[PDB]
Amino acid sequence: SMSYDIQAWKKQCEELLNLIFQCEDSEPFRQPVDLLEYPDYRDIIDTPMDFATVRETLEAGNYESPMELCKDVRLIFSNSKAYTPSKRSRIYSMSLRLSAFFEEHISSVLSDYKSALRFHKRN
Ligand SMILES: Cc1ccccc1NC(N)=S
């Protein structure tokens, strides 16, 4: 059970997603972009991603690890940098703040999970 629990990352990521939805900085990134308002979004972005999608994928049981979750969240940020490239944009700034918040918090979730992995593989 609790030390080196390889399932513990799920509730941790659920809690982090909760913090992210609270942050005013996540507002542009909560829901999928709308095609008909930004008709060019798909001209620029190959693989859309948003935090409601990540939260539903996690709820569905479709991430095998926290690294898979982290990949999808990092796609949100990389997509924002491609679509809104200008450092003058407030949206750019928001993206950067929220990325840094995510990367701070996910850090321990990842390290703990990989520790757990390393322990159970060794024993
Ligand atoms: C932040 C934003 C607002 C409106 C339209 C597009 C975007 N960019 C992404 N969601 S990647």
Author numbering: 1313 to 1435
What does the paper say about this structure?
Bromodomains are acetyl-lysine (KAc) reader domains involved in the modulation of gene expression. The second bromodomain of the pleckstrin homology domain-interacting protein (PHIP(2)) is one of the atypical bromodomains. PHIP(2) belongs to the bromodomain subfamily III alongside CREBBP.1 The atypical binding site of PHIP(2) is characterised by a threonine (Thr) residue (T1396) in place of the conserved asparagine. Because the Thr side chain is one atom shorter than Asn, there is space for an additional water molecule, dubbed the ‘PHIP water’, to mediate an interaction between T1396 and the typical water network at the back of the binding pocket.
All 406 poised fragments in DSPL1 were soaked into PHIP(2) Brd crystals and when the structures were solved, compounds 1–4 were found to have bound to the protein (1.2% hit rate). All of the poised fragment hits 1–4 bound to PHIP(2) Brd in the KAc recognition pocket. The thiourea sulfur of compound 1 displaces water I at the back of the binding pocket allowing the formation of hydrogen bonds with Y1353 and water II. The secondary thiourea nitrogen forms an H-bond to T1396 via the structural PHIP water (PW). The primary thiourea nitrogen lies in the hydrophilic pocket made by waters II, III and IV. The phenyl ring of compound 1 makes an edge–face aromatic interaction with Y1350, which is shifted significantly towards the ligand compared to the NMP-bound conformation. The ortho-methyl substituent on the phenyl ring makes additional interactions with the hydrophobic residues I1403 and P1340. The original fragment hit 1 had pIC50 of 3.11 in the AlphaScreen assay. The LE of fragment hit 1 was calculated to be 0.40. The thiourea 1 displaces one of the structural waters at the back of the PHIP(2) binding site, something rarely seen in other bromodomain ligand–protein complexes.
